[PDB]
Design a protein around this ligand. Structure first.
Ligand code: HEM
Ligand code: HEM
Lengths: 147, 148
């Protein structure tokens, strides 16, 4: 299990303003994997129109949802196995809308970048490792959707 | 037995056009039946006066988003709801821990049907009503396991 106290304490820095911190995660995501941008712009096209996609209700609602799923991983940090079936269903939904499984690895890198910006020196190697472990467990359960 | 998938998918698309409004409908009905559930969302909205101010609290609104995500998962796995059984039992355990009485989940069922009836109107046909009753029936059965 990822160290529960390290996870809970560090998550409090970002969890209460999910769009402020979530937009940081997604800005990093696009800087590391620019090719993801057309996938969101096309999703925006389906919802309404692609203009101002990164300010759109569907794009910001998606950030809120990513932050909510990360919060569930935090509240279930002691036994992440219980989320496995929920996450497998979410992973299968992503594959069905055309998201690459490899893009989830960039989300992990972006999650660590967002946390470090907020925590600075409090983001110790132990805390970074805990988050690496927690996110690893999340992406592993979501990857079941690729079965 | 198994909730008719197309009736579930079709009706859920309509309700997820406005999740915050429709989720608020579900909780408004639930609070009219069991007003004592509202304080469970007041941990950062500590007021006995005008407690409706707390329906605009982030914890209440994020919880609506959480409820919609769970239903979204039940809709995605509508062809095999047993696939969510261990997750739902753990989710049941979490609700028992915050102090939700097991009987309050029968009231959630009534509130869900009320919410679906309000937003769907004539589209909430006897067949669509039966599919949602079967879907909630399966969800609440797995959730009840969290009480042991
Ligand atoms: C890897 C980068 C990702 C991309 C390109 C992506 C894309 C999408 C798309 C296109 C949708 C459907 C429409 C929408 O909700 O705006 C979606 C839904 C969703 N995503 Fe993502 N997503 C990604 C990562 C994630 C991650 C990491 C999480 C959670 C940890 C997440 C959670 C969700 C949720 C909860 C939904 C709603 C699914 C549903 O409608 O049932 N997404 N995502
Ligand atoms: C009487 C009805 C209910 C009450 C009073 C209630 C109350 C709560 C409270 C107090 C929490 C903990 C704080 C929070 O995460 O927001 C919570 C969490 C949660 N609730 Fe509910 N809830 C109810 C119904 C439901 C239903 C019907 C669903 C799903 C269909 C649901 C899904 C969730 C989820 C996903 C969590 C997060 C649990 C976790 O962190 O793993 N709730 N609920």
């Amino acid at each position: 299990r990822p160290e529960p106290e390290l996870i809970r304490q560090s998550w409090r820095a970002v969890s209460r303003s999910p769009l402020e911190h979530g937009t940081v995660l997604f800005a990093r995501l696009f800087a590391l994997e620019p090719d993801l941008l057309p996938l969101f712009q096309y999703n925006c096209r389906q919802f309404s129109s692609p203009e101002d996609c990164l300010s759109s209700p569907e794009f910001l609602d998606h950030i809120r949802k990513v932050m909510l799923v990360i919060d569930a991983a935090v509240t279930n940090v002691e036994d992440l196995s219980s989320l496995e079936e929920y996450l497998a269903s979410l992973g299968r939904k992503h594959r069905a809308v055309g998201v690459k499984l490899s893009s989830f690895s960039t989300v992990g890198e972006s999650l660590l970048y967002m946390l470090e910006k907020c925590l600075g020196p409090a983001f110790t190697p132990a805390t970074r490792a805990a988050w690496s472990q927690l996110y690893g467990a999340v992406v592993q359960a979501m990857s079941r959707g690729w079965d």
